[PDB]
Amino acid sequence: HKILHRLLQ
Amino acid sequence: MLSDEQMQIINSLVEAHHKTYDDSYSDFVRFRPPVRLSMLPHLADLVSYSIQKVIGFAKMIPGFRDLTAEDQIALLKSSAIEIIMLRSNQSFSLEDMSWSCGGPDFKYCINDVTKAGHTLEHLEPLVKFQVGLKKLKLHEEEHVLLMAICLLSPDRPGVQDHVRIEALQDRLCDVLQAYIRIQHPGGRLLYAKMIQKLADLRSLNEEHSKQYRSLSFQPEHSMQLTPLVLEVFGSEV
Ligand SMILES: C=C1/C(=C\C=C2/CCC[C@]3(C)C(C4(CCCC(C)(C)O)CC4)=CC[C@@H]23)C[C@@H](O)C[C@@H]1O
Numbered sequence: 001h002k003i004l005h006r007l008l009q
Numbered sequence: 010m011l012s013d014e015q016m017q018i019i020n021s022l023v024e025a026h027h028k029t030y031d032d033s034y035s036d037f038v039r040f041r042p043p044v045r046l047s048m049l050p051h052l053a054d055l056v057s058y059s060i061q062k063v064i065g066f067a068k069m070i071p072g073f074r075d076l077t078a079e080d081q082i083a084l085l086k087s088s089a090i091e092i093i094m095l096r097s098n099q100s101f102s103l104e105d106m107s108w109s110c111g112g113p114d115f116k117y118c119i120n121d122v123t124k125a126g127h128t129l130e131h132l133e134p135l136v137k138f139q140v141g142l143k144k145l146k147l148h149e150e151e152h153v154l155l156m157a158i159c160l161l162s163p164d165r166p167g168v169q170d171h172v173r174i175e176a177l178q179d180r181l182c183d184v185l186q187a188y189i190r191i192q193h194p195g196g197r198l199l200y201a202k203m204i205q206k207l208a209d210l211r212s213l214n215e216e217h218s219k220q221y222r223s224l225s226f227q228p229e230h231s232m233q234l235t236p237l238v239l240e241v242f243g244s245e246v
Contacts, residue, residue, distance in 0.1 A: 004082050005078060006155075007064050008082070
Protein backbone atom coordinates (compact mmCIF):
# COMPACT_ATOMS: atom_id res chain seq x y z
CA HIS A 1 0.00 0.00 0.00
CA LYS A 2 2.49 2.68 -1.12
CA ILE A 3 -0.01 5.55 -1.40
CA LEU A 4 -1.80 4.86 1.91
CA HIS A 5 1.49 4.55 3.75
CA ARG A 6 2.73 7.83 2.25
CA LEU A 7 -0.52 9.65 3.09
CA LEU A 8 -0.49 8.28 6.65
CA GLN A 9 3.11 9.63 6.80
CA MET B 10 -22.28 16.35 32.83
CA LEU B 11 -19.18 15.58 30.71
CA SER B 12 -15.56 15.69 31.87
CA ASP B 13 -12.85 17.91 30.41
CA GLU B 14 -11.30 14.82 28.78
CA GLN B 15 -14.50 13.92 26.92
CA MET B 16 -15.04 17.55 25.97
CA GLN B 17 -11.54 17.62 24.49
CA ILE B 18 -12.22 14.53 22.35
CA ILE B 19 -15.29 16.35 21.02
CA ASN B 20 -13.30 19.50 20.23
CA SER B 21 -10.59 17.49 18.45
CA LEU B 22 -13.12 15.54 16.40
CA VAL B 23 -15.23 18.56 15.41
CA GLU B 24 -12.11 20.47 14.35
CA ALA B 25 -10.78 17.47 12.42
CA HIS B 26 -14.01 17.25 10.43
CA HIS B 27 -13.97 20.99 9.79
CA LYS B 28 -10.44 20.74 8.37
CA THR B 29 -11.27 17.85 6.02
CA TYR B 30 -14.75 18.77 4.78
CA ASP B 31 -15.23 21.82 2.59
CA ASP B 32 -18.80 23.10 2.41
CA SER B 33 -17.83 25.25 -0.59
CA TYR B 34 -17.20 22.07 -2.64
CA SER B 35 -14.94 24.29 -4.74
CA ASP B 36 -12.34 21.55 -5.31
CA PHE B 37 -14.93 19.59 -7.32
CA VAL B 38 -14.12 21.59 -10.46
CA ARG B 39 -10.81 19.66 -10.55
CA PHE B 40 -12.47 16.26 -10.99
CA ARG B 41 -13.07 14.86 -14.42
CA PRO B 42 -16.44 16.44 -15.24
CA PRO B 43 -19.78 14.64 -14.88
CA VAL B 44 -21.37 13.25 -18.04
CA ARG B 45 -25.09 12.37 -18.03
CA LEU B 46 -20.68 4.39 -17.58
CA SER B 47 -20.36 8.13 -18.21
CA MET B 48 -20.43 9.15 -14.53
CA LEU B 49 -17.65 6.74 -13.50
CA PRO B 50 -14.74 9.18 -14.09
CA HIS B 51 -16.33 12.01 -12.07
CA LEU B 52 -17.54 9.77 -9.24
CA ALA B 53 -14.23 7.89 -9.09
CA ASP B 54 -12.51 11.25 -8.68
CA LEU B 55 -15.15 12.25 -6.11
CA VAL B 56 -14.51 9.12 -4.06
CA SER B 57 -10.73 9.25 -4.48
CA TYR B 58 -10.69 12.84 -3.20
CA SER B 59 -12.98 11.80 -0.34
CA ILE B 60 -10.67 8.95 0.65
CA GLN B 61 -7.90 11.51 1.11
CA LYS B 62 -10.17 13.66 3.29
CA VAL B 63 -11.07 10.60 5.42
CA ILE B 64 -7.35 9.83 5.91
CA GLY B 65 -6.80 13.38 7.16
CA PHE B 66 -9.74 13.03 9.57
CA ALA B 67 -8.46 9.69 10.89
CA LYS B 68 -4.96 11.06 11.54
CA MET B 69 -6.49 13.69 13.85
CA ILE B 70 -8.63 11.22 15.83
CA PRO B 71 -7.10 10.99 19.34
CA GLY B 72 -4.97 7.85 19.46
CA PHE B 73 -5.32 6.80 15.82
CA ARG B 74 -1.85 8.14 15.02
CA ASP B 75 -0.38 5.96 17.78
CA LEU B 76 -1.59 2.69 16.26
CA THR B 77 0.92 0.79 14.16
CA ALA B 78 0.83 1.70 10.49
CA GLU B 79 -0.50 -1.81 9.79
CA ASP B 80 -3.60 -1.33 11.97
CA GLN B 81 -4.17 2.17 10.56
CA ILE B 82 -4.26 0.74 7.03
CA ALA B 83 -6.57 -2.15 7.95
CA LEU B 84 -9.04 0.23 9.61
CA LEU B 85 -9.10 2.67 6.70
CA LYS B 86 -9.35 0.00 3.99
CA SER B 87 -12.32 -1.63 5.68
CA SER B 88 -14.09 1.54 6.84
CA ALA B 89 -13.39 4.01 4.00
CA ILE B 90 -16.58 3.48 1.99
CA GLU B 91 -18.61 3.62 5.25
CA ILE B 92 -17.04 6.89 6.43
CA ILE B 93 -17.75 8.25 2.97
CA MET B 94 -21.35 7.04 3.03
CA LEU B 95 -21.70 8.72 6.45
CA ARG B 96 -20.03 12.03 5.64
CA SER B 97 -22.09 12.41 2.45
CA ASN B 98 -25.22 12.82 4.63
CA GLN B 99 -24.06 16.46 4.98
CA SER B 100 -24.74 17.09 1.26
CA PHE B 101 -27.75 14.78 0.93
CA SER B 102 -31.09 16.57 0.79
CA LEU B 103 -34.47 15.10 1.70
CA GLU B 104 -36.17 17.45 -0.79
CA ASP B 105 -34.81 16.09 -4.07
CA MET B 106 -33.49 12.75 -2.70
CA SER B 107 -29.98 13.46 -3.94
CA TRP B 108 -26.56 14.76 -2.93
CA SER B 109 -26.23 18.49 -3.67
CA CYS B 110 -22.66 19.81 -3.63
CA GLY B 111 -23.13 23.46 -4.50
CA GLY B 112 -24.25 23.71 -8.11
CA PRO B 113 -26.44 21.52 -10.32
CA ASP B 114 -23.50 19.91 -12.14
CA PHE B 115 -22.40 18.49 -8.75
CA LYS B 116 -25.92 17.35 -7.83
CA TYR B 117 -26.00 13.55 -8.01
CA CYS B 118 -29.43 12.01 -8.44
CA ILE B 119 -29.97 8.26 -8.31
CA ASN B 120 -29.83 8.05 -12.10
CA ASP B 121 -26.39 9.67 -12.07
CA VAL B 122 -24.98 6.90 -9.90
CA THR B 123 -26.40 4.12 -12.10
CA LYS B 124 -24.20 5.63 -14.86
CA ALA B 125 -21.20 4.62 -12.73
CA GLY B 126 -21.87 0.88 -12.48
CA HIS B 127 -24.25 0.59 -9.51
CA THR B 128 -27.61 -1.11 -9.83
CA LEU B 129 -30.56 0.03 -7.79
CA GLU B 130 -30.11 -3.20 -5.82
CA HIS B 131 -27.40 -1.16 -4.06
CA LEU B 132 -28.71 2.38 -4.45
CA GLU B 133 -32.07 1.59 -2.81
CA PRO B 134 -30.65 0.73 0.66
CA LEU B 135 -28.08 3.52 0.29
CA VAL B 136 -30.67 6.27 -0.15
CA LYS B 137 -32.93 4.72 2.49
CA PHE B 138 -29.88 4.83 4.75
CA GLN B 139 -29.25 8.49 3.92
CA VAL B 140 -32.92 9.37 4.52
CA GLY B 141 -33.06 7.62 7.90
CA LEU B 142 -29.75 9.21 8.89
CA LYS B 143 -31.05 12.62 7.82
CA LYS B 144 -34.19 12.06 9.92
CA LEU B 145 -32.02 11.49 13.01
CA LYS B 146 -31.11 15.21 12.72
CA LEU B 147 -27.79 14.60 14.43
CA HIS B 148 -25.71 17.27 16.07
CA GLU B 149 -22.34 17.90 14.48
CA GLU B 150 -20.75 16.54 17.67
CA GLU B 151 -22.72 13.32 17.15
CA HIS B 152 -22.03 13.12 13.43
CA VAL B 153 -18.26 13.32 13.95
CA LEU B 154 -18.38 10.94 16.95
CA LEU B 155 -20.19 8.37 14.80
CA MET B 156 -17.60 8.67 12.00
CA ALA B 157 -14.79 8.19 14.51
CA ILE B 158 -16.53 5.20 16.13
CA CYS B 159 -17.06 3.67 12.67
CA LEU B 160 -13.38 4.05 11.77
CA LEU B 161 -12.22 2.78 15.17
CA SER B 162 -14.07 -0.54 14.92
CA PRO B 163 -11.83 -3.46 15.97
CA ASP B 164 -14.10 -5.99 14.19
CA ARG B 165 -12.43 -5.40 10.85
CA PRO B 166 -10.38 -7.89 8.82
CA GLY B 167 -6.69 -7.33 9.32
CA VAL B 168 -6.51 -5.53 12.67
CA GLN B 169 -3.96 -6.97 15.09
CA ASP B 170 -4.23 -4.86 18.26
CA HIS B 171 -7.86 -5.64 18.96
CA VAL B 172 -7.54 -4.61 22.61
CA ARG B 173 -6.18 -1.13 21.90
CA ILE B 174 -8.67 -0.37 19.13
CA GLU B 175 -11.69 -1.54 21.16
CA ALA B 176 -10.56 0.61 24.09
CA LEU B 177 -10.41 3.67 21.81
CA GLN B 178 -13.87 2.89 20.43
CA ASP B 179 -15.32 2.36 23.92
CA ARG B 180 -14.03 5.74 25.10
CA LEU B 181 -15.66 7.35 22.05
CA CYS B 182 -18.96 5.56 22.62
CA ASP B 183 -18.92 6.76 26.25
CA VAL B 184 -18.39 10.35 25.09
CA LEU B 185 -21.26 9.97 22.65
CA GLN B 186 -23.61 8.28 25.10
CA ALA B 187 -22.95 11.04 27.63
CA TYR B 188 -23.18 13.76 24.96
CA ILE B 189 -26.65 12.59 23.93
CA ARG B 190 -27.93 12.26 27.49
CA ILE B 191 -26.70 15.66 28.68
CA GLN B 192 -26.76 17.84 25.54
CA HIS B 193 -29.48 16.45 23.23
CA PRO B 194 -33.15 16.93 24.30
CA GLY B 195 -35.42 14.04 23.42
CA GLY B 196 -32.50 11.76 22.55
CA ARG B 197 -33.79 8.98 24.78
CA LEU B 198 -33.34 6.29 22.12
CA LEU B 199 -30.92 8.09 19.78
CA TYR B 200 -27.76 6.25 20.84
CA ALA B 201 -29.35 2.92 19.93
CA LYS B 202 -30.54 4.31 16.59
CA MET B 203 -26.96 5.27 15.73
CA ILE B 204 -25.52 1.88 16.72
CA GLN B 205 -28.05 0.39 14.29
CA LYS B 206 -26.81 2.77 11.58
CA LEU B 207 -23.34 1.27 12.05
CA ALA B 208 -24.79 -2.17 11.28
CA ASP B 209 -26.52 -0.80 8.17
CA LEU B 210 -23.13 0.53 7.08
CA ARG B 211 -21.77 -3.03 7.18
CA SER B 212 -24.57 -4.22 4.90
CA LEU B 213 -23.93 -1.31 2.53
CA ASN B 214 -20.18 -1.99 2.58
CA GLU B 215 -20.79 -5.57 1.47
CA GLU B 216 -23.14 -4.57 -1.34
CA HIS B 217 -20.66 -1.95 -2.53
CA SER B 218 -17.88 -4.55 -2.59
CA LYS B 219 -20.00 -6.78 -4.83
CA GLN B 220 -20.70 -3.93 -7.24
CA TYR B 221 -17.14 -2.61 -7.09
CA ARG B 222 -15.70 -6.08 -7.68
CA SER B 223 -17.49 -6.20 -11.05
CA LEU B 224 -15.99 -2.83 -11.99
CA SER B 225 -12.50 -3.73 -10.78
CA PHE B 226 -12.60 -6.88 -12.95
CA GLN B 227 -13.37 -5.19 -16.29
CA PRO B 228 -10.11 -3.39 -17.32
CA GLU B 229 -12.04 -0.99 -19.57
CA HIS B 230 -13.85 0.09 -16.40
CA SER B 231 -11.09 -0.30 -13.82
CA MET B 232 -8.84 1.93 -15.96
CA GLN B 233 -11.24 4.80 -15.20
CA LEU B 234 -10.61 4.46 -11.44
CA THR B 235 -7.76 6.25 -9.69
CA PRO B 236 -4.68 4.66 -8.11
CA LEU B 237 -5.85 5.58 -4.55
CA VAL B 238 -9.28 4.00 -5.09
CA LEU B 239 -7.66 0.91 -6.62
CA GLU B 240 -5.29 0.49 -3.68
CA VAL B 241 -7.81 1.28 -0.90
CA PHE B 242 -10.74 -0.75 -2.29
CA GLY B 243 -8.41 -3.51 -3.45
CA SER B 244 -7.73 -6.84 -1.80
CA GLU B 245 -3.94 -6.71 -1.25
CA VAL B 246 -2.78 -7.46 2.30
C1 LIG C 1 -18.05 11.44 -1.46
C2 LIG C 1 -18.83 12.37 -0.84
C3 LIG C 1 -20.16 12.87 -1.47
C4 LIG C 1 -21.11 12.03 -1.88
C5 LIG C 1 -21.19 10.58 -1.85
C6 LIG C 1 -21.91 9.82 -2.69
C7 LIG C 1 -22.72 10.36 -3.84
C8 LIG C 1 -22.72 9.54 -5.13
C9 LIG C 1 -22.72 8.05 -4.84
C10 LIG C 1 -21.55 7.68 -3.91
C11 LIG C 1 -20.23 8.27 -4.43
C12 LIG C 1 -21.36 6.22 -3.51
C13 LIG C 1 -21.47 5.04 -4.47
C14 LIG C 1 -20.63 5.15 -5.76
C15 LIG C 1 -19.24 4.53 -5.57
C16 LIG C 1 -18.45 4.49 -6.88
C17 LIG C 1 -17.25 3.54 -6.90
C18 LIG C 1 -16.24 3.91 -5.75
C19 LIG C 1 -16.47 3.64 -8.23
O1 LIG C 1 -17.76 2.27 -6.61
C20 LIG C 1 -21.71 3.68 -3.86
C21 LIG C 1 -22.84 4.39 -4.52
C22 LIG C 1 -21.13 6.12 -2.22
C23 LIG C 1 -21.16 7.44 -1.52
C24 LIG C 1 -21.92 8.31 -2.54
C25 LIG C 1 -20.16 14.40 -1.59
C26 LIG C 1 -19.74 15.12 -0.25
O2 LIG C 1 -20.73 14.86 0.76
C27 LIG C 1 -18.35 14.57 0.28
C28 LIG C 1 -18.40 13.03 0.50
O3 LIG C 1 -17.10 12.53 1.00
